[PDB]
Design a protein around this motif. Structure first.
Motif, PDB file in Angstrom:
ATOM      1  N   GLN A   1       0.832  -1.199   0.000  1.00 40.58           N
ATOM      2  CA  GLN A   1       0.000   0.000   0.000  1.00 40.58           C
ATOM      3  C   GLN A   1       0.869   1.252   0.000  1.00 40.58           C
ATOM      4  O   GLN A   1       1.783   1.383   0.821  1.00 40.58           O
ATOM      5  CB  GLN A   1      -0.916   0.010   1.221  1.00 40.58           C
TER       6      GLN A   1
ATOM      7  N   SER B   1       0.574   5.508   0.121  1.00 43.32           N
ATOM      8  CA  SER B   1      -0.338   6.578   0.521  1.00 43.32           C
ATOM      9  C   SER B   1       0.452   7.843   0.820  1.00 43.32           C
ATOM     10  O   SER B   1       1.428   7.807   1.574  1.00 43.32           O
ATOM     11  CB  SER B   1      -1.151   6.161   1.746  1.00 43.32           C
TER      12      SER B   1
ATOM     13  N   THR C   1      -5.855   0.946  -7.815  1.00 37.40           N
ATOM     14  CA  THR C   1      -6.169   2.215  -7.147  1.00 37.40           C
ATOM     15  C   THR C   1      -7.655   2.573  -7.123  1.00 37.40           C
ATOM     16  O   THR C   1      -8.426   2.141  -7.981  1.00 37.40           O
ATOM     17  CB  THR C   1      -5.339   3.399  -7.725  1.00 37.40           C
ATOM     18  N   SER C   2      -8.033   3.368  -6.123  1.00 35.48           N
ATOM     19  CA  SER C   2      -9.393   3.899  -5.989  1.00 35.48           C
ATOM     20  C   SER C   2      -9.456   5.348  -6.454  1.00 35.48           C
ATOM     21  O   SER C   2     -10.540   5.907  -6.623  1.00 35.48           O
ATOM     22  CB  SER C   2      -9.857   3.837  -4.532  1.00 35.48           C
TER      23      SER C   2
ATOM     24  N   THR D   1      -9.085   3.084 -12.427  1.00 32.56           N
ATOM     25  CA  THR D   1      -9.738   2.641 -11.207  1.00 32.56           C
ATOM     26  C   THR D   1     -10.317   1.232 -11.380  1.00 32.56           C
ATOM     27  O   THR D   1     -10.829   0.895 -12.447  1.00 32.56           O
ATOM     28  CB  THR D   1     -10.841   3.658 -10.847  1.00 32.56           C
TER      29      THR D   1
ATOM     30  N   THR E   1       4.755   9.289  -8.370  1.00 33.74           N
ATOM     31  CA  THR E   1       3.309   9.313  -8.411  1.00 33.74           C
ATOM     32  C   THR E   1       2.855  10.766  -8.464  1.00 33.74           C
ATOM     33  O   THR E   1       3.228  11.570  -7.610  1.00 33.74           O
ATOM     34  CB  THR E   1       2.717   8.604  -7.177  1.00 33.74           C
TER      35      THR E   1
ATOM     36  N   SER F   1      -3.138   7.236  -3.510  1.00 32.94           N
ATOM     37  CA  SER F   1      -2.882   5.889  -3.034  1.00 32.94           C
ATOM     38  C   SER F   1      -2.911   4.870  -4.157  1.00 32.94           C
ATOM     39  O   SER F   1      -3.718   4.965  -5.083  1.00 32.94           O
ATOM     40  CB  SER F   1      -3.890   5.500  -1.949  1.00 32.94           C
ATOM     41  N   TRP F   2      -2.007   3.903  -4.070  1.00 32.30           N
ATOM     42  CA  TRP F   2      -2.069   2.731  -4.927  1.00 32.30           C
ATOM     43  C   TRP F   2      -1.529   1.490  -4.241  1.00 32.30           C
ATOM     44  O   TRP F   2      -0.739   1.567  -3.297  1.00 32.30           O
ATOM     45  CB  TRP F   2      -1.382   2.955  -6.285  1.00 32.30           C
ATOM     46  N   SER F   3      -1.987   0.348  -4.732  1.00 32.81           N
ATOM     47  CA  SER F   3      -1.531  -0.948  -4.281  1.00 32.81           C
ATOM     48  C   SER F   3      -0.656  -1.534  -5.381  1.00 32.81           C
ATOM     49  O   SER F   3      -0.967  -1.386  -6.563  1.00 32.81           O
ATOM     50  CB  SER F   3      -2.745  -1.838  -4.026  1.00 32.81           C
TER      51      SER F   3
END
Ligand SMILES: [Ca+2]
Ligand SMILES: [Ca+2]
Lengths: 433, 428, 433, 433
Positions: A208, A210, A243-244, A277, A307, A319-321
């Motif tokens: 994660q 952030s 990502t969201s 997304t 980013t 945020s990204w995973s």
């Protein structure tokens, strides 16, 4: 010992010339010697490090680093064979090698010579050494005959290459291959490939990320890992990003770092790369790094990710995973000698501006390139039975015989004359019939 | 035989300890033994299979599968060396290995069939208790209906000398933001490569479906115990607008179970009248492989943005993939497999495995500071003697799988000299 | 070895004195040694080159060049025999020769650290070397026993002359011949002639020249070619010029250029020479260059041509066509030793203001000139059978015996005492009868 | 001598590697070598002292002290083994050890004229030496082969460790023991304990103290005594105090003093010990000093008492009577080698700023710690009969053979080659069957 055994002579006294390795690798070849001669200049601290690759099947002999005020090393130059073997030969095998390191000069204003050498042969590649300081070297092996301490620089040290496996294959040198191309700077080679070394790095397993928005972005170093490369390598694999958050753009760069902490190679792996997304966002790795780009030994690899967001404000929280592993293949990297044994020769307290002189001989089994093959006769090695058994015996008794990989030169000289007590002309051939 | 020959002793009686291989691979090394000890529990059917990798250059010894009511195997656990060699050593070579398999407890007790098969696990055509017996034609590589109480001995016989040192899957110094970050230097020399041409203008045609239409484009038997990678590319063509492709690679275990699942392309629009590329850039690390991989398959999902009743989605596909399993062709890494199958053992009883593995090893940098390494002991005629013994393997009855009782007899029949050491004690 | 073999002793240890070559060249001769002693001064760069002619049948031993700040070489002096052989002898043959090259002295028989030496024996003449830099030397041969790298200057290097053919003829030295003439500066010699070397240069094959008029003319360098000369040479041949333009006058000069790029000899071949329209215009070459004019080794030859017009104006256009080849004969040039093998001793990192010391011994078979012949007894060589076979055996095993042409002096000294383990007085002659 | 005897080889030439001691102490062990390398800087006076502990069973090799203007020594640093043995091994036994002390500073570039060395092996611990001056050293033994005088520093000295008893027990190294604790600086070890050395010091036998009151108290030194320690120790015992003076408060402090007269450790033994009138007042000693607090060899011990009073004001008298013995137990102290034999190497007239170079090899029988024991095979020693008898013979003839503990290095080198005249490969194993 009767007369003697050409191979043992070559192995223990490489300055003597080459001999064919008496193993089972029966190729038509030719035997050659290449000298190495360098006059290195001592830096401000009076201290430095020579990294030797005693078993390297080709023209790379080592690298010289000076030690700096701030305690970092700084690359000086590669130490090579007198001529570039891949320009003339396509295949190669190391027979034997010895190098001597001594000071040959005291500078103009200097009253007294002083300086000492510590040396070790380490059974791993350069980046694997935990401690490379002058003092720390001494514990890189437990083997007493693979380390030597506080030899006077004036007297000097002898590095002797001892085998790490026989029945090795011929190694392809990095020889140029016939090619035409629109680019002047086009380079096409056939590389040492047999026995690749592979590193696998799982850089992320649902890692994660952030962070708040930034004009210019937020850069992170996802990972850094010690690897070794002197010649061509490639990076493969894939990271997957989730990502969201809408409108995130990713940049990613791979850096290959030298022994001196310096960036040797920098490659953008993905620049400006929008993330969608609710989907996997793939970031493939398709890197090929040619030999000629590697200006000094590679010691680590790292990946940075930038980013950024299209819009952007005060508090935006990006945020990204991330998930995935990479594979770093260094071609021919696991070929014994290519990266593996390393001999470090460290000097300190040498007067600034004085010359540290390196002189060596490397012996090879070689196969000529097509153009040279027209005028270079090749043969199967001289047969002498018991050559290999004798080698095996000698090495088996290595420690009781005191056969070192690093010597005080004075002790090596004594050993030469202690050994090699027969070289007997040739009694009545001259009077036979 | 005079005194004897350390290597032959080690080769034929591995529980005896290690000896250096008398080949031409002259490296400074150290010699070590690692035991394997397992107490496996017998399942409902009273039947199961132990897969051994007798030549594996490292800590993986085998895997245990129980047989189930429905006739499928179910993975139990990996069988390993007592300690994880890659934590302490970087390079390794197998000297000799023996394992014994027998029951030790009851809730006498069923039978064993065993074979040494000259191929990797997925290459066996028949893995049933009975079917094993025909995996080789070699009489000294199979043993049938040995009583479980007495047990079986697996002896590792060479598949090539002058092998290189293998890099173990040793951790490499690395820092990273992820706790679960793993960096190793893998067995690589002598890779095995599979090439799969998954499609050569393969036409796909099907009616629309909410959720899509999934197909299995191909399935192929491969072998992996350690890290592998998948490369290559599929190219898709289509006349239909707005098609979206999903594709996943599954690596399947010996028990039919999914070991690893990797999305290769999810949500991926196809353009009309152009090549649509689907690259494969997969790297599968060792630690993800929880049991031996036995096959690989690729599924493709096809869906459409709009969608109706009859819509007919079609695409053409072309391309081949390459599966590289690192160090896979190194003799011993995948190749010889010894299967020990048991049946009719009472449910709940213990099948006991005990073994010794002998290695030539090079210590990792931290251990190298305190671990002296040397070139092997020289004894001439050791290799010739080995060659002679193996040359007469069948007339001497040197098996890879033994009834333990017969192996015990062999030990004492062989090894009739171990003679103290006559007048050194009285010499001068 | 029994007692020993005078010739082998002389060959391998020339400082020992001369011996007759045991070949088939049976001439009444006399045996002599000539020393060479030089104290050379090191220049600004601390770097330089000594060119040795190890096989030279006469008094020329080599030449010294300094390296200068700018990276170019500059001739210092010829290195000669102690006395000028051609003043006393008419014919000569080289038996054996060794030379020492070192620097630095300190109380106690001890030497200092004073830089390094690279040395090679190259199987060609001076101008044939592709690379003459300190480092580049090391690849002039593939023979490991014909190169030595980074020897400390204080310790020094030993150059040993190894044969390039026996059964060589006696060479005429450049001896003065009885002559009277009106010119004080008149010189008459009888030169090394047997086995000339001939270069053929086709300078033009209908080469078109075209250029606008110039007061003073337009000068071109028609060709430049690498050749070698230490002693007398001649240039023969002819260029033929055609033209349609009236009133063209040609000037042509031959330059013989030294190793240091300097003009050694300049000879006008044709000055002020009118060209006729529609005819061959001949330009013959009748050059004889005497030994005494060659102040340093010749390394190349070039021909310049001046085209002038006299009455030319604004922009006229001058054109001619040229055809022809030249022959450069260097007398006795192909006699093995006269030009052929070259040993280069390069030094660097030598402390400025130190002196590089050369000491050598050359051994000869000689025939006295008429005046000396009156008091110099000559004889056929001592007969010992097996001397030549033993020489052939030794040389045949050259590499396994490690018989080098260039040695670290310390290693040569060891070799001397390792060899030469019998010199046994002479047991009971003293007690015989 | 036949082949030879591994142990004798190791004993007389430690740089050769380890061998098992052929005594009756049959433990499964492993054999290791540890180098010592130091470049020490010479101080203002050009003079100093190296204290060696030739028999020390572990990583402590010695200590270096510079000599100062005022004639005092000043501690520089401990001289250790390359790596800290107690971090990897739990038990240890010394096999053999040699060390080299020479200046690496060579005036002019070659000369060894840079001051001199005096050296002795003293059969007692450091604090027992009556005279430690450069000159005074020479009479610390009567044994001619345990002293060497005025060796040139450039040539240097060799310290050879000769046995002080065999059949010694394995010594526990100061190895860390598994422990958790609230304090970061918590340290738990298992110490060299076998064979304790005990000093008993009767500090007072009714000693009458009497002095006038002073704010903050009045300090006396009750006693000082020469003791020795390099590692952990403890002080036990009791002083009993009698007084007629009311409200006296006693403080006690033990000082452990280095060889250079510096306080290494200071510990309060008593504080706020209020003395009760007309009664025994006990002052127990319960000190434990860990190895790690000892930063240099302890050469002496002293106890100070501070005596303060409540409402003391003017001619207020303070008086106590004291009686009691202390016992100072230094753990492992009497283990031969732990403190006992000391070799002193003193240099003088060395130029300020020059480097005194120490190089050594120490050989050990070792038992790995639990973590290493998992990967370290241990064995009983190689059996060769007559090894011990041969050692006993050699040592019995020590003086006639001239086997020194301190050598001029040149003489030791000669001895090496005089001895060790057989190391004979291994005749027909290679041709046997
Ligand atoms: Ca072989
Ligand atoms: Ca002839």
């Amino acid at each position: 010992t009767q007369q003697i055994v050409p191979f043992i002579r070559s192995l223990l006294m490489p300055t003597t010339g080459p001999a064919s390795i008496p193993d089972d690798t029966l190729e038509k070849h030719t035997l050659r010697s290449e000298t190495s001669t360098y006059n290195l200049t001592v830096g401000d601290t009076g201290s430095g490090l020579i990294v030797f690759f005693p078993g390297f099947p080709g023209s790379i002999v080592g690298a010289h680093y000076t030690l700096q005020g701030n305690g970092n090393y700084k690359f000086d130059q590669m130490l090579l064979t007198a001529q570039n073997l891949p320009a003339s030969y396509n295949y190669c095998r190391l027979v034997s090698r010895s190098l001597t390191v001594r000071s040959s000069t005291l500078p103009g204003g200097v009253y007294a010579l002083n300086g000492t050498i510590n040396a070790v042969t380490f059974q791993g590649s350069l980046s694997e050494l935990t401690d490379v300081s002058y003092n720390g070297l001494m514990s890189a092996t437990a083997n007493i005959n693979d380390k030597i301490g506080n030899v006077l620089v004036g007297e000097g040290v002898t590095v002797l290459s001892l085998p790490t496996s026989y029945d090795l294959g011929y190694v392809r040198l990095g020889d140029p291959i016939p090619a035409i191309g629109l680019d002047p700077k086009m380079v096409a080679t056939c590389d040492s490939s047999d026995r690749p070394r592979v590193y696998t790095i799982t850089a992320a397993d649902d890692y994660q990320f952030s962070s708040q928005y930034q004009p210019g972005g937020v850069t992170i170093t996802l990972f850094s890992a010690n690897i070794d490369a002197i010649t061509s390598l490639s990076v493969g694999g894939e990271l997957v990003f989730r990502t969201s958050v809408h409108g995130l753009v990713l940049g990613a760069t791979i850096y290959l770092i030298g022994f001196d902490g310096t960036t040797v190679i920098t490659r953008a792996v993905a620049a400006n790369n929008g993330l969608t997304t609710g989907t996997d966002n793939l970031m493939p790795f398709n890197l090929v790094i040619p030999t000629n780009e590697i200006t000094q030994p590679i010691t680590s690899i790292k990946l940075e990710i930038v980013t950024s967001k299209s819009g952007g404000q005060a508090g935006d929280q990006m945020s990204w995973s991330a998930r995935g592993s990479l594979a770093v293949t260094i071609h021919g990297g696991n070929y014994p000698g290519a990266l593996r044994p390393v001999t470090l020769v460290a000097y300190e307290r040498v007067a600034t501006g004085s010359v540290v002189t390196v002189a060596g001989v490397s012996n090879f089994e070689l196969i000529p390139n097509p153009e040279l093959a027209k005028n270079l006769v090749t043969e199967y090695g001289r047969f002498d039975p018991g050559a290999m058994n004798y080698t095996k015996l000698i090495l088996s008794e290595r420690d009781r015989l005191g056969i070192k990989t690093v010597w005080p030169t004075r002790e090596y000289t004594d050993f030469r004359e202690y050994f090699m007590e027969v070289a007997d002309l040739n009694s009545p051939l001259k009077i036979a019939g």
